[PDB]
Structures are given as C-alpha cells and as structure tokens.
Amino acid sequence: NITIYHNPASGTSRNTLEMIRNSGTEPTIILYLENPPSRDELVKLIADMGISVRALLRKNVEPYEQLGLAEDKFTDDQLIDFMLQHPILINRPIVVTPLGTRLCRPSEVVLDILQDAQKGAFTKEDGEKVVDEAGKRL
Ligand SMILES: [Cs+]
Ligand SMILES: [Cs+]
Ligand SMILES: [Cs+]
Numbered sequence: 001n002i003t004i005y006h007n008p009a010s011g012t013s014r015n016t017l018e019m020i021r022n023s024g025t026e027p028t029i030i031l032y033l034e035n036p037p038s039r040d041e042l043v044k045l046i047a048d049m050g051i052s053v054r055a056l057l058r059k060n061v062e063p064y065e066q067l068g069l070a071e072d073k074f075t076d077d078q079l080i081d082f083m084l085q086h087p088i089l090i091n092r093p094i095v096v097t098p099l100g101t102r103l104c105r106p107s108e109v110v111l112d113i114l115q116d117a118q119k120g121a122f123t124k125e126d127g128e129k130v131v132d133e134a135g136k137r138l
Helices: 011-021 039-049 062-067 077-084 108-114
Strands: 003-007 028-031 095-097 102-103 129-133
Touching: 003 011, 039 077, 039 095, 039 102, 062 102, 102 108, 108 129
Parallel strands: 003 028
Antiparallel strands: 003 095, 095 102
16 A cells, blocks of 8 residues: 655656556555645655655755745744645655655665565666666666
8 A cells, every 4th residue: 555646747756656566556646736745644754754854845946946945044844834835845756655655766765665576677767777687676
C-alpha cells in the first residue's frame, strides 16, 4: 500500500512513479497540485520524512518568488500554511509506503522505502542507470 504525491510535469516524479511500478506495485496517485494534503496530513508527512519544513519548499516557482520565501523570516507553521494555499510550493514527489515516507529527490531515494526489490534493471528517462539486472545500485 503505497501513495505518491505526483506531478506529471516533473521528471523526478515520473522516474519515481516508474520505480514504484518496477517493484510490482501500482500506487495510489494523488495529483497534489489539485488535491493537496490537509494540514494535518502535511504535518505528518513532514514529520515522517525527517526533513525540515523549509527543505520541502520548491524554489523557482511563482509563489516562492513573490512571497519572498528565500528570506529567513518565516516560521515553520507560516511555511506549512503557504504550502497548503499554494501547493506548487510542495516539492515532489512525496511517497508513503508501509516502511516509511520520503521526499524522493533524487528519485532513487524511493528504493529505501519500497518493500519489494526492483524486478529488473531500471534506467531513468535521461539514460542514467539506477539498478542493473542483478539488482545492484549503480
Ligand atoms: Cs486532502
Ligand atoms: Cs499564476
Ligand atoms: Cs528497501
């Protein structure tokens, strides 16, 4: 039982989603830009991911620029509420499995929380080899 907060327009997210599938599981896909987590859910995700709230913020997007978020003048709860109101600020993808939750940047971080091994070699969209046929990480 796996959930991915996915952005089809993200190469990292597309690579992550294909690695999930290559472990033999079809995840529940949440298109977070349109169906963001609730506050409670986002707070839990952040806790489980082991990163700071700021580390989840995606840079180079309109609200990051216009709200001035690069500046260190925001508490964690201020940043969480911005993410909820502007979901493009939530970096991607976040994956939840029975083993744990991770921000899968780079995509192969997802290998930590997938329960079943990749079923064969995996190469990212751009040609970067991730696991070989034998299952060894490169
Ligand atoms: Cs929701
Ligand atoms: Cs806009
Ligand atoms: Cs694992």
